Design an enzyme around this catalytic site. Structure first.
Site, PDB file in Angstrom:
ATOM      1  N   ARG A  54       0.994  -1.110  -0.056  1.00 32.70           N
ATOM      2  CA  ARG A  54      -0.118  -0.039  -0.091  1.00 32.70           C
ATOM      3  C   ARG A  54       0.814   1.273   0.114  1.00 32.70           C
ATOM      4  O   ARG A  54       1.549   1.430   1.016  1.00 32.70           O
ATOM      5  CB  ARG A  54      -0.901   0.047   1.163  1.00 32.70           C
ATOM      6  CG  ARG A  54      -1.762   1.111   1.185  1.00 32.70           C
ATOM      7  CD  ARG A  54      -2.889   1.324   2.207  1.00 32.70           C
ATOM      8  NE  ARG A  54      -3.944   0.260   2.509  1.00 32.70           N
ATOM      9  CZ  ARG A  54      -4.104  -0.228   3.300  1.00 32.70           C
ATOM     10  NH1 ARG A  54      -4.016  -0.162   4.311  1.00 32.70           N
ATOM     11  NH2 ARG A  54      -5.408  -1.280   3.069  1.00 32.70           N
ATOM     12  N   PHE A  59       1.387  10.630   1.510  1.00 29.64           N
ATOM     13  CA  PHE A  59       0.965  10.124   2.858  1.00 29.64           C
ATOM     14  C   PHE A  59       2.028   9.070   3.507  1.00 29.64           C
ATOM     15  O   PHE A  59       2.590   9.166   4.427  1.00 29.64           O
ATOM     16  CB  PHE A  59      -0.471   9.597   2.877  1.00 29.64           C
ATOM     17  CG  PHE A  59      -1.424  10.395   2.608  1.00 29.64           C
ATOM     18  CD1 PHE A  59      -1.982  11.327   3.754  1.00 29.64           C
ATOM     19  CD2 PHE A  59      -1.945  10.652   1.176  1.00 29.64           C
ATOM     20  CE1 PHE A  59      -2.748  12.231   3.611  1.00 29.64           C
ATOM     21  CE2 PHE A  59      -2.947  11.871   1.329  1.00 29.64           C
ATOM     22  CZ  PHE A  59      -3.450  12.655   2.284  1.00 29.64           C
ATOM     23  N   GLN A  62       3.303   1.466   3.088  1.00 29.65           N
ATOM     24  CA  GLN A  62       2.980   0.638   4.228  1.00 29.65           C
ATOM     25  C   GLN A  62       3.350  -1.007   3.863  1.00 29.65           C
ATOM     26  O   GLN A  62       3.056  -1.142   2.364  1.00 29.65           O
ATOM     27  CB  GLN A  62       1.429   0.550   4.478  1.00 29.65           C
ATOM     28  CG  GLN A  62       1.033  -0.456   5.475  1.00 29.65           C
ATOM     29  CD  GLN A  62      -0.526  -0.585   5.657  1.00 29.65           C
ATOM     30  OE1 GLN A  62      -1.053   0.557   5.626  1.00 29.65           O
ATOM     31  NE2 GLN A  62      -1.093  -1.220   6.414  1.00 29.65           N
ATOM     32  N   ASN A 101      -2.068  -1.167  12.227  1.00 28.94           N
ATOM     33  CA  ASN A 101      -2.783  -2.126  13.012  1.00 28.94           C
ATOM     34  C   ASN A 101      -4.315  -2.176  12.641  1.00 28.94           C
ATOM     35  O   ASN A 101      -4.716  -1.439  11.665  1.00 28.94           O
ATOM     36  CB  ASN A 101      -2.740  -1.758  14.613  1.00 28.94           C
ATOM     37  CG  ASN A 101      -3.291  -0.314  14.891  1.00 28.94           C
ATOM     38  OD1 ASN A 101      -4.437  -0.024  14.644  1.00 28.94           O
ATOM     39  ND2 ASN A 101      -2.270   0.229  15.479  1.00 28.94           N
ATOM     40  N   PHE A 112       4.321   1.198   8.474  1.00 28.01           N
ATOM     41  CA  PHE A 112       4.313   2.343   7.453  1.00 28.01           C
ATOM     42  C   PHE A 112       5.610   3.261   7.895  1.00 28.01           C
ATOM     43  O   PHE A 112       5.871   3.602   8.608  1.00 28.01           O
ATOM     44  CB  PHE A 112       3.005   2.824   7.331  1.00 28.01           C
ATOM     45  CG  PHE A 112       2.622   3.615   8.483  1.00 28.01           C
ATOM     46  CD1 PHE A 112       2.005   2.886   9.690  1.00 28.01           C
ATOM     47  CD2 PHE A 112       2.463   4.943   8.583  1.00 28.01           C
ATOM     48  CE1 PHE A 112       1.522   3.501  10.898  1.00 28.01           C
ATOM     49  CE2 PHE A 112       1.697   5.696   9.728  1.00 28.01           C
ATOM     50  CZ  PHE A 112       1.525   5.239  10.824  1.00 28.01           C
ATOM     51  N   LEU A 121      -2.895  10.372  13.292  1.00 27.18           N
ATOM     52  CA  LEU A 121      -2.405   8.775  13.741  1.00 27.18           C
ATOM     53  C   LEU A 121      -1.887   8.974  15.065  1.00 27.18           C
ATOM     54  O   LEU A 121      -1.910   7.658  15.390  1.00 27.18           O
ATOM     55  CB  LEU A 121      -1.756   8.303  12.613  1.00 27.18           C
ATOM     56  CG  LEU A 121      -2.149   8.440  11.398  1.00 27.18           C
ATOM     57  CD1 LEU A 121      -1.081   7.746  10.338  1.00 27.18           C
ATOM     58  CD2 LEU A 121      -3.511   7.781  11.115  1.00 27.18           C
ATOM     59  N   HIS A 125      -1.212   4.902  16.647  1.00 25.33           N
ATOM     60  CA  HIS A 125      -0.283   4.044  16.101  1.00 25.33           C
ATOM     61  C   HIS A 125       0.942   4.441  16.818  1.00 25.33           C
ATOM     62  O   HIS A 125       1.460   5.496  16.991  1.00 25.33           O
ATOM     63  CB  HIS A 125      -0.086   4.175  14.490  1.00 25.33           C
ATOM     64  CG  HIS A 125      -1.216   3.857  13.792  1.00 25.33           C
ATOM     65  ND1 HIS A 125      -1.437   2.769  13.199  1.00 25.33           N
ATOM     66  CD2 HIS A 125      -2.307   4.477  13.372  1.00 25.33           C
ATOM     67  CE1 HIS A 125      -2.590   2.768  12.333  1.00 25.33           C
ATOM     68  NE2 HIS A 125      -3.061   3.772  12.706  1.00 25.33           N
TER      69      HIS A 125
END
Ligand SMILES: CCn1c(-c2cc(N3CCN(C)CC3)cnc2[C@H](C)OC)c2c3cc(ccc31)-c1csc(n1)C[C@H](NC(=O)[C@H]1C[C@@H]1C)C(=O)N1CCC[C@H](N1)C(=O)OCC(C)(C)C2
Ligand SMILES: Nc1nc2c(ncn2[C@@H]2O[C@H](COP(=O)(O)OP(=O)(O)NP(=O)(O)O)[C@@H](O)[C@H]2O)c(=O)[nH]1
Ligand SMILES: [Mg+2]
Lengths: 163, 169
Positions: A54, A59, A62, A101, A112, A121, A125
């Site tokens: 991903r 951004f 991951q 997660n 990531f 986040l 995270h």
């Protein structure tokens, strides 16, 4: 002294370059040690051979699903999942390394790398490291991503270990 | 040529939005949980003898991005409002999705279908009558589904097309 690990990134099997990371063992020892051991492969399993499944430009990138290789899997060295160690460190900008997660206390092996600040986040995270060398490799990876994360080429961790 | 219908699948995390859609598109089900960023699909089908093209938006259940639903709600023509029959909190979330859709479209008359999914499972916590009563109060159909057994999968998407046809006449 904080450990250092490296990823040798490849693109459809052709080398791109090496990213190295400082793992903040001084703040999040349990999380850093999981990532360290998965990078060395010393439990007989880990990040080598797995993909960045991903990638979303602007951004993050991951990866880390070495058990199912489809974005749904992964496992820690402590069992399938382990708890959120702490949320001391924050998602302050590009290069931050942090755990993926599926909600509270579900850390496995997916992680990531931020390519921008992702402050929403924070507190959700666990941040546990950051890019040391090779941020230009992570930036090079972004153009293989897309709006929903699907990559247009296979981005793989061809090799990894501890420095 | 054939009419295109813009269906949008919404609902809480993990209720089966993607599993319903992939059953529709690829005729298979997997137990693994691949949480959605955003996905889109196309399929042609025949409904009441009329061939049409379904454009399906499979949306994220992630609650932290609730402020980012407005544009896809403006664009969509009809909404599958999916909850899981073993997850009372996902049934409660339905009302907030429906209010958001009405507010964003500035209309009390938006094509929607209530979907209670995972009806293969034994741990049911939402009575059928409880869902049918809610649907009746909304003026929309209620359909029970299982993505695992395929029960009701075609019916849910097709019923939504019928609701959109009625809206456009
Ligand atoms: C609304 C659209 N959307 C968006 C989004 C958000 C914005 N904002 C603009 C304004 N600012 C102020 C706020 C945010 C803009 N544009 C988009 C995208 C580009 O619109 C298409 C995101 C997102 C994340 C999820 C679902 C939908 C989502 C999601 C779905 S599961 C998830 N998160 C958490 C994810 N678990 C997993 O994979 C589990 C399977 C493993 C074990 C996970 O641990 N990680 C790591 C951290 C990053 C996260 N993945 C991820 O991929 O975040 C994508 C990102 C783009 C960063 C956020
Ligand atoms: N037994 C059973 N499990 C189902 C059913 N539908 C989905 N599941 C399971 O429930 C989990 C979540 O399904 P998923 O389709 O990913 O849900 P989602 O609503 O798209 N999640 P998100 O909003 O994060 O994208 C998966 O493990 C899936 O296999 C169903 O009808 N029966
Ligand atoms: Mg989904």
């Amino acid at each position: 002294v904080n450990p250092t690990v490296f990823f040798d990134i490849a693109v459809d099997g052709e080398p791109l370059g090496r990213v190295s990371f400082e793992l903040f063992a001084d703040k999040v020892p349990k999380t850093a040690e999981n990532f360290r051991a998965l990078s060395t492969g010393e439990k007989g399993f880990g990040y080598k051979g797995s993909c960045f499944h991903r990638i979303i430009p602007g951004f993050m990138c991951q990866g880390g699903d070495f058990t199912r290789h489809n974005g749904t899997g992964g496992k820690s060295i402590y069992g399938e999942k382990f708890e959120d160690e702490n949320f001391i460190l924050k998602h302050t900008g590009p290069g931050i390394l942090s755990m993926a997660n599926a909600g509270p206390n579900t850390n496995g092996s997916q992680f990531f790398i931020c390519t921008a600040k992702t402050e929403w986040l924070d507190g959700k995270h666990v941040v546990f490291g950051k890019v040391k060398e090779g941020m230009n490799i992570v930036e090079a990876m972004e153009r293989f991503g897309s709006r929903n994360g699907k990559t247009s080429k296979k981005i793989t961790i061809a090799d990894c270990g501890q420095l | 040529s054939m009419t295109e219908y813009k269906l949008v699948v919404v609902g809480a995390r993990g209720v089966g939005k993607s599993a319903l859609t992939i059953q529709l598109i690829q005729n298979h089900f997997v137990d693994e949980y691949d949480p959605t960023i955003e996905d889109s699909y196309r399929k042609q089908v025949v409904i009441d003898g009329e061939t049409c093209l379904l454009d399906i938006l499979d949306t994220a259940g992630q609650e932290e991005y609730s402020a980012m639903r407005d544009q896809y709600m403006r664009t969509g023509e009809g909404f599958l409002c999916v909850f899981a029959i073993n997850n009372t909190k996902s049934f409660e979330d339905i009302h907030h999705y429906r209010e958001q859709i009405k507010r964003v479209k500035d209309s009390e008359d938006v094509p929607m279908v209530l979907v209670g999914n995972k009806c293969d499972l034994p741990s049911r916590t939402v009575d059928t009558k409880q869902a049918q009563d809610l649907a009746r109060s909304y003026g929309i159909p209620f359909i029970e589904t299982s993505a695992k057994t395929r029960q009701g999968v075609d019916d849910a998407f097709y019923t939504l097309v019928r609701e959109i046809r009625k809206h456009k006449e």
